[PDB]
Scaffold this active site. Structure first.
Site, PDB file in Angstrom:
ATOM      1  N   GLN A 171      41.676  40.641  37.907  1.00 31.57           N
ATOM      2  CA  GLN A 171      41.888  42.478  37.857  1.00 31.57           C
ATOM      3  C   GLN A 171      42.624  42.877  39.471  1.00 31.57           C
ATOM      4  O   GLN A 171      42.706  43.750  39.658  1.00 31.57           O
ATOM      5  CB  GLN A 171      40.336  42.799  37.779  1.00 31.57           C
ATOM      6  CG  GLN A 171      40.472  43.532  37.661  1.00 31.57           C
ATOM      7  CD  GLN A 171      38.625  44.610  37.549  1.00 31.57           C
ATOM      8  OE1 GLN A 171      38.099  45.518  37.147  1.00 31.57           O
ATOM      9  NE2 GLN A 171      37.567  43.747  37.030  1.00 31.57           N
ATOM     10  N   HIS A 175      45.993  45.521  40.518  1.00 31.10           N
ATOM     11  CA  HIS A 175      45.416  46.578  41.355  1.00 31.10           C
ATOM     12  C   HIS A 175      45.905  47.144  42.096  1.00 31.10           C
ATOM     13  O   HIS A 175      45.946  47.894  43.324  1.00 31.10           O
ATOM     14  CB  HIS A 175      44.274  47.364  41.398  1.00 31.10           C
ATOM     15  CG  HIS A 175      43.426  47.344  39.404  1.00 31.10           C
ATOM     16  ND1 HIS A 175      44.437  46.426  38.631  1.00 31.10           N
ATOM     17  CD2 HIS A 175      43.090  47.868  38.692  1.00 31.10           C
ATOM     18  CE1 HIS A 175      43.137  46.916  37.834  1.00 31.10           C
ATOM     19  NE2 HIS A 175      42.884  47.851  37.617  1.00 31.10           N
ATOM     20  N   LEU A 352      51.367  45.328  28.711  1.00 35.55           N
ATOM     21  CA  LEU A 352      50.900  44.224  29.075  1.00 35.55           C
ATOM     22  C   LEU A 352      49.933  43.207  30.327  1.00 35.55           C
ATOM     23  O   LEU A 352      49.431  41.783  29.418  1.00 35.55           O
ATOM     24  CB  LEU A 352      52.915  42.926  28.926  1.00 35.55           C
ATOM     25  CG  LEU A 352      52.841  41.686  28.892  1.00 35.55           C
ATOM     26  CD1 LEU A 352      53.575  41.453  28.360  1.00 35.55           C
ATOM     27  CD2 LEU A 352      53.613  41.683  30.821  1.00 35.55           C
ATOM     28  N   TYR A 353      49.895  43.897  30.764  1.00 36.03           N
ATOM     29  CA  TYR A 353      48.421  42.657  31.966  1.00 36.03           C
ATOM     30  C   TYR A 353      47.405  44.412  31.833  1.00 36.03           C
ATOM     31  O   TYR A 353      46.391  43.341  32.932  1.00 36.03           O
ATOM     32  CB  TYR A 353      49.253  43.079  33.341  1.00 36.03           C
ATOM     33  CG  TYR A 353      49.266  42.265  34.476  1.00 36.03           C
ATOM     34  CD1 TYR A 353      47.855  40.737  33.700  1.00 36.03           C
ATOM     35  CD2 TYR A 353      50.350  41.676  34.942  1.00 36.03           C
ATOM     36  CE1 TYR A 353      48.415  40.178  34.535  1.00 36.03           C
ATOM     37  CE2 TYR A 353      49.990  40.432  35.469  1.00 36.03           C
ATOM     38  CZ  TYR A 353      49.386  39.304  35.713  1.00 36.03           C
ATOM     39  OH  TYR A 353      49.152  38.177  35.429  1.00 36.03           O
ATOM     40  N   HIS A 356      41.856  44.129  29.191  1.00 36.52           N
ATOM     41  CA  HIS A 356      40.104  44.217  29.291  1.00 36.52           C
ATOM     42  C   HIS A 356      39.228  43.270  28.590  1.00 36.52           C
ATOM     43  O   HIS A 356      38.192  43.303  28.324  1.00 36.52           O
ATOM     44  CB  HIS A 356      40.235  45.809  28.599  1.00 36.52           C
ATOM     45  CG  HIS A 356      40.349  46.260  29.888  1.00 36.52           C
ATOM     46  ND1 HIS A 356      42.377  46.796  29.798  1.00 36.52           N
ATOM     47  CD2 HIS A 356      39.574  46.597  31.239  1.00 36.52           C
ATOM     48  CE1 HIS A 356      42.180  47.529  31.608  1.00 36.52           C
ATOM     49  NE2 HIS A 356      40.995  47.473  32.262  1.00 36.52           N
ATOM     50  N   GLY A 494      55.571  38.463  29.737  1.00 34.20           N
ATOM     51  CA  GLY A 494      54.597  37.945  30.596  1.00 34.20           C
ATOM     52  C   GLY A 494      55.097  37.611  32.093  1.00 34.20           C
ATOM     53  O   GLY A 494      55.401  37.486  32.513  1.00 34.20           O
ATOM     54  N   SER A 498      56.614  38.630  36.073  1.00 34.52           N
ATOM     55  CA  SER A 498      55.628  37.438  36.690  1.00 34.52           C
ATOM     56  C   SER A 498      56.021  36.707  37.671  1.00 34.52           C
ATOM     57  O   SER A 498      55.145  36.060  37.948  1.00 34.52           O
ATOM     58  CB  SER A 498      54.130  37.596  35.529  1.00 34.52           C
ATOM     59  OG  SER A 498      52.595  37.305  36.737  1.00 34.52           O
TER      60      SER A 498
HETATM   61  C1  HEM Z   1      33.685  45.108  34.055  1.00 33.26           C
HETATM   62  C2  HEM Z   1      35.686  46.083  34.382  1.00 33.26           C
HETATM   63  C3  HEM Z   1      36.448  46.746  33.386  1.00 33.26           C
HETATM   64  C4  HEM Z   1      36.525  47.696  33.818  1.00 33.26           C
HETATM   65  C5  HEM Z   1      35.245  48.328  33.783  1.00 33.26           C
HETATM   66  C6  HEM Z   1      37.919  48.689  33.553  1.00 33.26           C
HETATM   67  C7  HEM Z   1      38.314  49.136  33.069  1.00 33.26           C
HETATM   68  C8  HEM Z   1      39.598  49.902  32.976  1.00 33.26           C
HETATM   69  C9  HEM Z   1      39.781  51.297  32.848  1.00 33.26           C
HETATM   70  C10 HEM Z   1      39.162  52.356  33.198  1.00 33.26           C
HETATM   71  C11 HEM Z   1      41.074  51.831  34.461  1.00 33.26           C
HETATM   72  C12 HEM Z   1      42.205  52.867  33.354  1.00 33.26           C
HETATM   73  C13 HEM Z   1      42.830  53.434  32.191  1.00 33.26           C
HETATM   74  C14 HEM Z   1      41.747  54.932  31.894  1.00 33.26           C
HETATM   75  O1  HEM Z   1      40.980  54.463  31.097  1.00 33.26           O
HETATM   76  O2  HEM Z   1      42.645  56.204  32.108  1.00 33.26           O
HETATM   77  C15 HEM Z   1      41.849  50.018  34.041  1.00 33.26           C
HETATM   78  C16 HEM Z   1      43.075  50.042  34.508  1.00 33.26           C
HETATM   79  C17 HEM Z   1      43.260  49.080  34.529  1.00 33.26           C
HETATM   80  N1  HEM Z   1      42.662  47.828  33.859  1.00 33.26           N
HETATM   81 FE1  HEM Z   1      40.836  47.349  34.164  1.00 33.26          FE
HETATM   82  N2  HEM Z   1      39.025  47.106  33.972  1.00 33.26           N
HETATM   83  C18 HEM Z   1      37.746  46.581  33.973  1.00 33.26           C
HETATM   84  C19 HEM Z   1      38.816  45.380  34.028  1.00 33.26           C
HETATM   85  C20 HEM Z   1      40.284  44.666  34.530  1.00 33.26           C
HETATM   86  C21 HEM Z   1      40.923  43.194  34.317  1.00 33.26           C
HETATM   87  C22 HEM Z   1      39.852  41.878  34.298  1.00 33.26           C
HETATM   88  C23 HEM Z   1      42.273  43.369  34.627  1.00 33.26           C
HETATM   89  C24 HEM Z   1      42.879  42.475  34.450  1.00 33.26           C
HETATM   90  C25 HEM Z   1      43.340  42.339  35.494  1.00 33.26           C
HETATM   91  C26 HEM Z   1      42.144  44.738  34.389  1.00 33.26           C
HETATM   92  C27 HEM Z   1      43.394  45.558  33.710  1.00 33.26           C
HETATM   93  C28 HEM Z   1      44.080  46.374  34.495  1.00 33.26           C
HETATM   94  C29 HEM Z   1      45.159  47.091  34.466  1.00 33.26           C
HETATM   95  C30 HEM Z   1      46.665  46.651  34.438  1.00 33.26           C
HETATM   96  C31 HEM Z   1      45.288  48.355  34.538  1.00 33.26           C
HETATM   97  C32 HEM Z   1      46.343  48.830  35.212  1.00 33.26           C
HETATM   98  C33 HEM Z   1      45.728  49.853  36.389  1.00 33.26           C
HETATM   99  C34 HEM Z   1      46.710  51.366  36.334  1.00 33.26           C
HETATM  100  O3  HEM Z   1      47.076  52.013  35.142  1.00 33.26           O
HETATM  101  O4  HEM Z   1      46.656  51.841  37.903  1.00 33.26           O
HETATM  102  N3  HEM Z   1      40.941  45.686  34.821  1.00 33.26           N
HETATM  103  N4  HEM Z   1      41.158  49.180  33.745  1.00 33.26           N
HETATM  104  C1  LIG Z   2      55.901  27.925  36.536  1.00 34.01           C
HETATM  105  O1  LIG Z   2      55.845  29.751  36.699  1.00 34.01           O
HETATM  106  C2  LIG Z   2      55.320  30.647  35.585  1.00 34.01           C
HETATM  107  C3  LIG Z   2      54.612  31.280  36.320  1.00 34.01           C
HETATM  108  C4  LIG Z   2      54.078  32.315  35.991  1.00 34.01           C
HETATM  109  C5  LIG Z   2      53.898  31.885  34.709  1.00 34.01           C
HETATM  110  C6  LIG Z   2      54.525  31.095  33.155  1.00 34.01           C
HETATM  111  C7  LIG Z   2      55.067  30.773  34.270  1.00 34.01           C
HETATM  112  C8  LIG Z   2      53.991  31.158  32.808  1.00 34.01           C
HETATM  113  C9  LIG Z   2      54.511  30.041  31.357  1.00 34.01           C
HETATM  114  C10 LIG Z   2      56.950  29.905  32.130  1.00 34.01           C
HETATM  115  O2  LIG Z   2      57.145  30.730  32.130  1.00 34.01           O
HETATM  116  O3  LIG Z   2      56.374  28.406  31.625  1.00 34.01           O
HETATM  117  C11 LIG Z   2      53.195  32.237  32.939  1.00 34.01           C
HETATM  118  C12 LIG Z   2      52.424  32.051  31.001  1.00 34.01           C
HETATM  119  N1  LIG Z   2      52.951  33.033  33.931  1.00 34.01           N
HETATM  120  C13 LIG Z   2      52.216  34.015  33.907  1.00 34.01           C
HETATM  121  O4  LIG Z   2      51.309  33.407  35.462  1.00 34.01           O
HETATM  122  C14 LIG Z   2      51.677  35.209  33.312  1.00 34.01           C
HETATM  123  C15 LIG Z   2      52.278  36.489  33.955  1.00 34.01           C
HETATM  124  C16 LIG Z   2      52.357  37.193  33.551  1.00 34.01           C
HETATM  125  C17 LIG Z   2      51.196  37.488  31.606  1.00 34.01           C
HETATM  126  I1  LIG Z   2      50.984  39.666  30.784  1.00 34.01           I
HETATM  127  C18 LIG Z   2      50.612  36.506  31.360  1.00 34.01           C
HETATM  128  C19 LIG Z   2      51.355  35.273  31.893  1.00 34.01           C
END
Ligand code: HEM
Ligand SMILES: COc1ccc2c(c1)c(CC(=O)O)c(C)n2C(=O)c1ccc(I)cc1
Ligand code: HEM
Ligand SMILES: *[C@@H]1O[C@H](CO)[C@@H](O[C@@H]2O[C@H](CO)[C@@H](O)[C@H](O)[C@H]2NC(C)=O)[C@H](O)[C@H]1NC(C)=O
Ligand SMILES: *[C@@H]1O[C@H](CO)[C@@H](O[C@@H]2O[C@H](CO)[C@@H](O)[C@H](O)[C@H]2NC(C)=O)[C@H](O)[C@H]1NC(C)=O
Ligand SMILES: COc1ccc2c(c1)c(CC(=O)O)c(C)n2C(=O)c1ccc(I)cc1
Ligand SMILES: *[C@@H]1O[C@H](CO)[C@@H](O)[C@H](O)[C@H]1NC(C)=O
Ligand SMILES: *[C@@H]1O[C@H](CO)[C@@H](O)[C@H](O)[C@H]1NC(C)=O
Ligand SMILES: *[C@@H]1O[C@H](CO)[C@@H](O)[C@H](O)[C@H]1NC(C)=O
Ligand SMILES: *[C@@H]1O[C@H](CO)[C@@H](O)[C@H](O)[C@H]1NC(C)=O
Lengths: 551, 551
Positions: A171, A175, A352-353, A356, A494, A498
């Site tokens: 997370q 961000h 894709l990332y 939640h 991914g 990534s």
């Molecule tokens: C306590 C649990 C969590 C809460 C409160 C939460 C909440 C949110 C919310 C509110 C959004 C924005 C979209 C919207 O609702 O308008 C968001 C975006 C995002 N969250 Fe979380 N999230 C949580 C955990 C995480 C985790 C573990 C990840 C995984 C990395 C994550 C990944 C994302 C991503 C990629 C975005 C988009 C960022 C952006 O648009 O700038 N979040 N999250």
């Molecule tokens: C060794 O290089 C890498 C580096 C990163 C890699 C991987 C291999 C693989 C598998 C592979 O490519 O072998 C996944 C799963 N990865 C991720 O970190 C990932 C990124 C975004 C999302 I959404 C989900 C996974």
């Protein structure tokens, strides 16, 4: 009807329109010829007819621990990794191509860095159905789709062993390169940098960095509470933070990523890194008494970018994949390759990332089990418990499986609703198209996507066509690999975005990968040997169980 | 004393300071080992002991017209060119390294695009003399140095045949990537883009482009005067221009590069390109009735960037060099190479390109011979004479030699004074150091730099040491090659920055070099066959003598 709505051009060929009713596929360098880039070249033919499934491979990499142990010790650990690096990356274009505004190459796209890029152009606004040619004229109600197939009914913990330590790590890290401009709308990012610039630590702009900076020894400001080092207060570092109305400055920690104040996990990691940055400043000054603030600061930040890229790659990735193969972070494996040290965050990638489902039902800190309502804007839990306590806690509590269906806690289920909706504003192409983009065979039926008949049957009556199944749902509803956190698509779409995103940072270039860039052998090794345990423990009075794997 | 003032590290090794009195050279990947990166590797040794002088080569390329004619017709035209491309480019780092603020690699340097980059770090502010260790504690008075060795006494026309058409072309083209922020100080540029983005036509920012745009058929606004197409008035396109106080909007042409209003040559070329952009819009719309403004506009701009890169390379360069070898612009010669499609304008480059000696004593337009005072802010000369008339004129009047000494007209001699002064603010390293950076042997005496004894003797008593001779003067006072426009250094420092800068534009990448990027075969060929004559003539009622060479 717009001929391009039929997605005529295969293998990355470009559908250019001509006249009122014609179209032409640009198959330049696609490996295919023909009106639709479908007739392969003898080599292309071999190359693909011999490509073992991503499934076949994910089997091997997760099997034969003994055989791997040997390989891991041979030179082959590098050889494979390299192949992975090169190959994986090719899937992602550079320089970047389209954006929310241009479904064509253009100077503005290439230069206006406020846009997230995208791999496939949008579904032309003049197509019969929302997804082009197939499916219904109306798409499933986001809300409903969310409650029917994503709402967590019974918590499914991740079989791989992933814990909240990893969850919060993901997370935090994401961000710094996912930061949608709510003021500009979807498609726009505030994270110009588009990558691991560590801007979630130093700020996404000069003004803010200067606010957070001590301007002494290269150190970042901070405060002592309970004899421990924590991010400064908004009073000391008058920086913009997102804290609910009613919370005083003196109770808000200023950190760089305005949003980080709404979750102890987030503010936990912000504290470990702030600590780490100031720690490295000392190592540097000692070595270079002659240096000033700026240079200590700048060099400190390059060492942390390096640390981050390493942990992120050898411990963070490793855990996810589940492979036995020792992913090695070595910028040099790429020195012989043709690689572009450049990156640009794609909208597909922000979706894709959006993992939640990882968040649990409650947050257990020892005998204490806190609710979302007790965790969420808890300005006191971190200073109360301190780094070690939380680090042990999150390291011990499992996070939930990411792929599979019905595993997103109701508390944040709204986020998935929004994601599906944004997807539509962005006019993303269908899941099955992305399948092909990333070199996979498109699904022939819902029952093949999901590994069953119940959900499949209903997704079918909702979508109409498998060829109309949207990106995000497709990603979270597809079947998981054996005892995996998620499935094929996640991984096959991914890793590319990534890895390219990491190896493409400027510090991985031959130009910057020099001991002098890091202030000498010391900074360089800090990078070369970074580690999750070192990161936490060298910055805490005691060293708790610290891992991305549950004990 | 700062050990780095001794410029201890050879062959691009990096001088890192340590302790209070130590220093260490980072010779990573320099091809040398040792405390100062001076002990070569067997290959490095060969590679250099066998490198024929830049002098030996410039001989060959300018000789044997007959032998060249054959080569030019063989496949070898590509082969050489490629070698030139690869090799020449290696001299320039990417990603970029230092800036006015950082004599070290740093995220800010890499990301803050307002800075011009620099190849060699500055002369540490704590060195004995301004140039480090040698020369006097005070440097020659810029003004005096300028009147003694750069002031044009007798006009020396360029032996190569270069005319004002080329001169103005150079002036135009350079001011799209040279645009110092007077508000920020030296070291800062307004031309974020750092290259051939054609921003001197469309504007250095969105707001301004939108002002200049017709928002119809992809066309750029304009006006008809005498039945001819000319840039719109500041009244129509309320854009910021630099015209002397007292000139009304209705008499100012809005163009993109605010400065272009102060010289018919400049506004001449701005007119040819505006004409060309609108011409291509038509070619496109015809082909793609379905397209809108944006796409016609965006695709038009990519075609012009391509045109520009071609002319700039096969006609603009060709003339300068003087070679018999047909420089071929083909982005594909680089597809096999390891190249970074990225660029960043270096401060050294803004200096080395300040060719003010080119301007003549008066500007002859037929029987009419205009003075600087009649040319300079002449809002009427272009509309009066029209494109053709001026194009014939400038194509016929020779421009003055660039290298050699005493050939800059008094009217603009102040500019050279400023350049020397800025050089010092920028704290540029000595000429002799740059010599080495670009793979040349440093001069042993002033009499070797200049091809004589008189000036050499005085430069000597002024500078004290040849090792204290500044960059710019060194560039303009060094001896010209046989019947050349300038000499070694210009060329050996000039081409690198100047080729990498072109081949490194994103459109030259395999990702963008596709017929679809240009709207199909038509746009693509426009690029592929661009030409100075076509550029002028396809946009004028009659076609005058048009060349970079005097008849
Ligand atoms: C306590 C649990 C969590 C809460 C409160 C939460 C909440 C949110 C919310 C509110 C959004 C924005 C979209 C919207 O609702 O308008 C968001 C975006 C995002 N969250 Fe979380 N999230 C949580 C955990 C995480 C985790 C573990 C990840 C995984 C990395 C994550 C990944 C994302 C991503 C990629 C975005 C988009 C960022 C952006 O648009 O700038 N979040 N999250
Ligand atoms: C060794 O290089 C890498 C580096 C990163 C890699 C991987 C291999 C693989 C598998 C592979 O490519 O072998 C996944 C799963 N990865 C991720 O970190 C990932 C990124 C975004 C999302 I959404 C989900 C996974
Ligand atoms: C009528 C003759 C010309 C005049 C009036 C002129 C004048 C100037 C002046 C005033 C400066 C700014 C520095 C200063 O004085 O403070 C300048 C900068 C520049 N000129 Fe010219 N010039 C002429 C022709 C050209 C030509 C033919 C070239 C060659 C391409 C050229 C190249 C440059 C460069 C590189 C700069 C730096 C641009 C920047 O700093 O943004 N100029 N010129
Ligand atoms: C990057 O692109 C965005 C979108 O075109 C630009 O933002 C818009 O710019 C126009 C002109 O300034 C305004 O009318 C819009 O209100 C702007 N905002 C949005 C959200 O559309 C932005 O200016 C561009 N940035 C740069 C540096 O070129
Ligand atoms: C790029 O770097 C320049 C120089 O650091 C920045 O400009 C200065 O920024 C600070 C803080 O905003 C001000 O106190 C100075 O007055 C600014 N101007 C100058 C001329 O120094 C600039 O803000 C940076 N730009 C970005 C986008 O990071
Ligand atoms: C074929 O590729 C090229 C492309 C451009 C080239 C050259 C070769 C050469 C010579 C060479 O490299 O062969 C010079 C002279 N070039 C310049 O345009 C130039 C740039 C800046 C300055 I100041 C002076 C000259
Ligand atoms: C190209 O694709 C279109 C749309 O699917 C199809 O109608 C046409 O038959 C295809 N042509 C060939 C040669 O495959
Ligand atoms: C914040 O967390 C602490 C535990 O450290 C808890 O006692 C407190 O009640 C929480 N605050 C809220 C509003 O839930
Ligand atoms: C390295 O360079 C310094 C400064 O020129 C010189 O004093 C020293 O002798 C050099 N050492 C070697 C081994 O060349
Ligand atoms: C401008 O140029 C014209 C020639 O077209 C000339 O007659 C006029 O006098 C010039 N203006 C000035 C102020 O020199």
């Amino acid at each position: 009807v717009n001929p391009c709505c039929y997605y005529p051009c295969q293998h990355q060929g470009i559908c250019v329109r001509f006249g009122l009713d014609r179209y032409q596929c640009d198959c330049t360098r696609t490996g295919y010829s023909g009106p639709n880039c479908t007739i392969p070249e003898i080599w292309t033919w071999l190359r693909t007819t011999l490509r073992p499934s991503p499934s076949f491979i994910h089997f091997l990499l997760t099997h034969g621990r003994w055989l791997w142990d040997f390989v891991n010790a041979t030179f082959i650990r590098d050889t494979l990794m390299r192949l992975v690096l090169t190959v994986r990356s090719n899937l992602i274009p550079s320089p970047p191509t389209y954006n929310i505004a241009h479904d064509y190459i253009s100077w503005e796209s290439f230069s206006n860095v406020s846009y997230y890029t995208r791999i496939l152009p949008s579904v032309p606004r003049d197509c019969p159905t929302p997804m082009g040619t197939k499916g219904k004229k109306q798409l499933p109600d986001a809300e409903f789709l969310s409650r029917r197939f994503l709402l967590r009914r019974k918590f499914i913990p991740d079989p791989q062993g992933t814990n909240l330590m990893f969850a919060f790590f993901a997370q935090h890290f994401t961000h710094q390169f996912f930061k949608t401009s709510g003021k500009m709308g979807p498609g726009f990012t505030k994270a110009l940098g588009h990558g691991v610039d560590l801007g979630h630590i130093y700020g996404d702009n000069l003004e803010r960095q200067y606010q957070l900076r001590l301007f002494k020894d290269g150190k970042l400001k901070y405060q002592m509470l309970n004899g421990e080092v924590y991010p400064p207060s908004v009073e000391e570092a008058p920086v913009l933070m997102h804290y609910p109305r009613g919370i005083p400055p003196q109770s808000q920690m200023a950190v760089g990523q305005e949003v980080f104040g709404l979750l102890p996990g987030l503010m936990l990691y912000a504290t470990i890194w702030l600590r780490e940055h100031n720690r490295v400043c000392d190592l540097l000054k000692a070595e270079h008494p002659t240096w000033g603030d700026e240079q200590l600061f700048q060099t400190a930040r390059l060492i942390l970018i390096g640390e981050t890229i390493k942990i992120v790659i050898e411990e963070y990735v490793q855990q996810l994949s589940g492979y036995f193969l020792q992913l090695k972070f070595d910028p040099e494996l790429l020195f012989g390759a043709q690689f572009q040290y450049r990156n640009r965050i794609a909208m597909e990638f922000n979706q894709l990332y959006h993992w939640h489902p990882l968040m649990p039902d409650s947050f257990r800190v020892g005998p204490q089990d806190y609710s979302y309502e007790q965790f969420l804007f808890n300005t006191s839990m971190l200073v109360d418990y301190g780094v070690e306590a939380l680090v042990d806690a999150f390291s011990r509590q499992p996070a939930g499986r990411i792929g599979g269906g019905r595993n997103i806690d109701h508390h944040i289920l709204h986020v998935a609703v929004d994601v599906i909706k944004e997807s539509r504003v962005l006019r993303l192409q269908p899941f099955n198209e992305y399948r092909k983009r990333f070199g996979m065979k498109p699904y022939t039926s819902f029952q093949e996507l999901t590994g069953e008949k119940e959900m499949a049957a209903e997704l079918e009556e909702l979508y109409g066509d498998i060829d109309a199944l949207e990106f995000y749902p497709g990603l979270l509803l597809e079947k998981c690999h054996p005892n995996s956190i998620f499935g094929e698509s996640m991984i096959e779409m991914g890793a590319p975005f990534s890895l390219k995103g990491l190896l493409g940072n400027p510090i991985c270039s031959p130009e910057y990968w020099k001991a002098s860039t890091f202030g000498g052998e010391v900074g360089f090794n800090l990078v070369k040997t970074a580690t999750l345990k070192k990161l936490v423990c060298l910055n805490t009075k005691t060293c708790p169980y610290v891992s991305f794997h549950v004990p």
